[PDB]
Amino acid sequence: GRVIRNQRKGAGSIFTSHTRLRQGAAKLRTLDYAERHGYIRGIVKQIVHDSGRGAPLAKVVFRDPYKYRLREEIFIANEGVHTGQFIYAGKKASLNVGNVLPLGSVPEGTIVSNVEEKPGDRGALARASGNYVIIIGHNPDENKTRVRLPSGAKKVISSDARGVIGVIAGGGRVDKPLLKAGRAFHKYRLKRNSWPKTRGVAMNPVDHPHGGGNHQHIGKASTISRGAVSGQKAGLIAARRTGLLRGSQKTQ
Template identity: 35%
Template sequence: VNPDLHKGAPHAPLLEKQHQKSGRNNNGHITTRHKGGGHKHHYRVVDFKRNDKDGIPAKIERLEYDPNRSANIALVLFADGERRYIIAPKGAVVGQVVANGPEAPIKAGNNLPIRNIPVGTTIHCVEILPGKGAQIARSAGTSAVLLAREGIYAQVRLRSGEVRRVHIECRATIGEVGNEEHSLRQIGKAGATRWRGIRPTVRGVAMNPVDHPHGGGE
């Protein structure tokens, strides 16, 4: 448990209700097995675009836990008085100032177009299409590296080793995603997995022939 995380309630204007799907689609059929139950939680509206506050500095007010993702989130207060959630970068501290836009300095937590980022920089929260919002390298401890720029495209190497080509007008955030020790957590007991909405995984061999290719047999 991170002692720096906010202990109180989340920022209410940035919450939305979430309906539990339990792995079902709009026909009620199970499309993802082993889902259901778990604790209720609200969705935290995270700003993945960060493209309409260029040139307006923001201060990190607090770091918060988010039940909907592995990364922590940061509540930032912009100079114009608006508050938003962003993905908390590695090393983020309360009181830190973050900036958006082409003029932003190359500093962890700042968001700018890839054409303004030096080659070799570690980045996260990378857009695939300009203006769509970050889709790559958003989970805890992840990052990507800007390898090269050629014309209107840039090459970005992901943690998996895959190299993706993205438009230089796509935006990215400098640094890595925080909460990198997320993968080391001890779940402790079966019930803690159930709290997260994950149901038991039954082996195919233990089923009947009607239920699974491995079913049946003595």
């Protein structure tokens, strides 16, 4: 038959990101001499909606240590941070909502957001509205720090990797029913072309594994192997269990 929908996504012709109104990429400061020996001060100048994003961004500006001028940065705003607020970034900074410190300088239990997976990568973990990572221990020899991500996973990263104190703003966005098709419309209109969604079970065989039959139905197990092949992976990929999850989840 033909190439199915989930294979056409990859050439991203009509599947690229709707990017025009975006404020620019959100990132921590480049890890320089300031941030990595002392601290440097900025001011949050503006906290602002970024199309397609849930959490607002915070525009923060710092003096350039090496040239006379102002260099502006695009943060994700943590709940609580405000215009006019002074933001402190650096190894020798202090534990306040909004500041940005390396995980090695913050006690166990600290709550942080936008943390780096390697030092200097300018931020990777816990950016979505409401998310955060908890520091749960340090190993001072080979300076690592163990953290717990939004997903539940624990992971150890360099104690030099940086994070910003607190939680990302916009929480509870998903507590509210969309109610109508149209709000999803405007939702995905500012993201990418993934909406709405025809069930493969409503297409013909040319179109999809699930396609065809004189009743709608999948007709074989819908849990597909990891080592299945492009054109085969529709359904429950690599699913280690299936069915209604019964009883407390919670990573132990």
